[PDB]
Structure 1
Amino acid sequence: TSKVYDPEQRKRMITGPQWWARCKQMNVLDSFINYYDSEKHAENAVIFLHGNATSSYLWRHVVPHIEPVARCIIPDLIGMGKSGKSGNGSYRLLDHYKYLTAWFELLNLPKKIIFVGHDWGAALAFHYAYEHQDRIKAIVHMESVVDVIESWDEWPDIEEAIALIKSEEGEKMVLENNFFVETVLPSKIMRKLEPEEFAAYLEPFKEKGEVRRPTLSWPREIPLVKGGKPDVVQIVRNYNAYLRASDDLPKLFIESDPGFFSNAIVEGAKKFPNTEFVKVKGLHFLQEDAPDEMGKYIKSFVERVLKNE
């Protein structure tokens, strides 16, 4: 079987170099962050955070829907997209968080921020929110790291999968074969990407070896209490308890099709109060199959949050 191009998508395609020319760079700590900033309507800030395998490019067709109502800021996480590399070559959640929060300090942000998070980008938003509970206006999340995986909540073979990614076989899958870009990314998009769109995702990780480390380090942070990184399990424990009790924080959850990793996410998200639920037909990288539906859903949600404020 093979997937097929969307015949109407090529008309509006934005290549990597087209996107990267639209971005800015700012030095941050011992490195720098590449990011997109629509600048206008700076009274609010909507910060879009990608997760593993991707970059700010993931949001290119989503963000135009929100720009008319709020300043949109979209970083490439450290070591990803066109950003700088981490000073110590470490790419754990806390390394990403260190660069992200230092970048926030330089952005002239409003007091209360709106976050839109996918995958580990949602973990970063949730952790920031837990540590800055007075800085959060609303959180949109999707395919998110919502909670830990307790021993009794393990589903069949999650043990196998995490042992695989933490093994040397997993390291070679990523560092040598570029598993998350070459395999996972296209496998979790329903359409076939245009060659230029795939090239934009490949470009940061085109060379073999250690440059692909961020895409290996992210899954190894998974908060499986059985053998998971204790610091990340505690981080997720803390922000999950905060989210479960955050009755006054408006949230939007965008659901996609069920998957091997997906079922724990949706059940965890329904434990957070004040959550508006919506659905798009897509897989994990749902931005590539329903960007306009997503953008219109986020826009209505932001409009409702602001008007009701």
Structure 2
Amino acid sequence: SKVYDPEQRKRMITGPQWWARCAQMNVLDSFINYYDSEKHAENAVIFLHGNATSSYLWRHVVPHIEPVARCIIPDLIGMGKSGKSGNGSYRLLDHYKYLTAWFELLNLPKKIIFVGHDWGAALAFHYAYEHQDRIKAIVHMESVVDVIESWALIKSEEGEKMVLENNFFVETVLPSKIMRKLEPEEFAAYLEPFKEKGEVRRPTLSWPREIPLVKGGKPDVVQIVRNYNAYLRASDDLPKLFIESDPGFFSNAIVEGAKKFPNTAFVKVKGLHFLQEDAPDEMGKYIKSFVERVLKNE
């Protein structure tokens, strides 16, 4: 049985409160909603959420890192309070198109630090592969580290029903993979972008449909993941931090995959999948110390 954190309401940040702290920037034919801590712009730490969530996910993690580096946190296209995709497509490369265009408008330093979760990690990994000179360090967790060989309906018409009609990922999966019980306002912040039925929920269906299954998975995504996996396995000069979820959720293949990447520090924190909601401060402190060590080592 899940229970509320009894100290959490006193520091709760509602959706409206978070969105009031964000800015909007035009990007290609749309716009991106994002948080930007602004100060210490000699460095940039870019935090990337994955399916079902938004920049809101990182709200209690980022304050720990802000004093060491500029922190930038987008809502991915079609998610959070960001604009929608010009053609209504939300595959990995659609997200990447808008993300990379946004990066060009941010006045980033030559080398950037990424923090990725879920498909947010895949975006960071793909960016790294295609910009090998622009990466200072990478932190990842519950991430798309490799293709899946070992261990249908979502891709079927029922999947459209499950998600567009029944909101499966936001209303069934999300709360099931948080160990605590979310405050009502906190869940409401995740529901808001996807409160209405139909096409507005597309990104939450398109993400799982990108799954890099060798047998049956989108061939272009399988190749993207193979490519960045090989690069990451050879990236001895690239410092990495892997945050392992305890107990996690079916997370063993993530951990063994993560261990194939050289120059990785390993830490562990409480959680299932959305560990930011169960151990944000522990995560923030680990990330802070890692970043500090990376910058001193330079």
The TM-score by the shorter chain falls in which range? Answer: over 0.9
Cα distance, 1:209 vs structure 2: 0.6
Deviations 1:51-92 (A, max 9, x none): 000000000000000000000000000000000000000000
Q: State the distance in 1 between where 2:39 and 2:140 align.
A: 23
Deviations 1:186-206 (A, max 9, x none): 001011000000000000000
Deviations 1:283-302 (A, max 9, x none): 10000000000000000000
Secondary structure in structure 1 of the residue aligned to 2:66: coil
Secondary structure in structure 2 of the residue aligned to 1:281: strand
* Stretches of 4+ aligned residues off by more than 6 angstroms: none
**Residue 6 and residue 259 in structure 1: after superposition, are their counterparts in 2 closer, same or farther (change >3 A)?**
closer
Deviations 1:17-57 (A, max 9, x none): 00000000000001000000000000000000000000000
Residue matched to 1:259? 248
**Residue 260 and residue 71 in structure 1: after superposition, are their counterparts in 2 closer, same or farther (change >3 A)?**
closer
Q: Number of residues paired by the alignment? A: 297
Cα distance, 1:149 vs structure 2: 1.0
Residue 248 of structure 2 contacts residue 271 of structure 2 at CA under 8 Å; is this kept in 1? Answer: no
Secondary structure in structure 2 of the residue aligned to 1:143: strand
Deviations 1:209-240 (A, max 9, x none): 11000000000000001010000000000000
RMSD: 0.9
Q: State the distance in 1 between where 2:25 and 2:184 align.
A: 29
Residue 78 of structure 1 contacts residue 99 of structure 1 at CA under 8 Å; is this kept in 2? Answer: yes
Residue 151 of structure 1 contacts residue 226 of structure 1 at CA under 8 Å; is this kept in 2? Answer: no
Cα distance, 1:151 vs structure 2: 5.2
Deviations 1:112-143 (A, max 9, x none): 00000000000000000000000000000000
Residues 229-248 of structure 1 correspond to what in structure 2 (within 5 A)?
Answer: 229-248=218-237
The answer on 1:307 being equivalent to 2:279 is: no
**Greater CA deviation, 180-189 or 58-67?**
180-189
Cα distance, 1:183 vs structure 2: 1.0
Residue 249 of structure 2 contacts residue 272 of structure 2 at CA under 8 Å; is this kept in 1? Answer: no
Q: State the distance in 1 between where 2:34 and 2:138 align.
A: 20
**Residue 259 and residue 306 in structure 1: after superposition, are their counterparts in 2 closer, same or farther (change >3 A)?**
closer
**Residue 102 and residue 203 in structure 1: after superposition, are their counterparts in 2 closer, same or farther (change >3 A)?**
same
Residue matched to 1:39? 38
Cα distance, 1:171 vs structure 2: 1.6
Cα distance, 1:165 vs structure 2: 1.2
Deviations 1:129-179 (A, max 9, x none): 000000000000000000001258xxxxxxxxxxx2111122211111111
**Residue 228 and residue 258 in structure 1: after superposition, are their counterparts in 2 closer, same or farther (change >3 A)?**
farther
Residue matched to 1:275? 264
Residue 282 of structure 1 contacts residue 289 of structure 1 at CA under 8 Å; is this kept in 2? Answer: yes
TM-score (ref. length: structure 1): 0.95
Cα distance, 1:257 vs structure 2: 2.9
Cα distance, 1:264 vs structure 2: 1.2
Residue matched to 1:73? 72
Q: State the distance in 2 between where 1:299 and 1:149 align.
A: 31
Cα distance, 1:258 vs structure 2: 4.5
Q: State the distance in 2 between where 1:262 and 1:151 align.
A: 13
Runs of at least 5 residues in structure 2 that lack an aligned partner in the other structure: none
Q: Percent identity?
A: 99
Cα distance, 1:259 vs structure 2: 5.1
Which of 180, 193, 196 pairs up with 1:191?
A: 180
Residues 133-282 of structure 1 correspond to what in structure 2 (within 5 A)?
Answer: 133-150=132-149, 164-258=153-247, 261-282=250-271
Residue 255 of structure 1 contacts residue 279 of structure 1 at CA under 8 Å; is this kept in 2? Answer: yes
Runs of at least 5 residues in structure 1 that lack an aligned partner in the other structure: 153-163
Q: State the distance in 1 between where 2:191 and 2:139 align.
A: 27
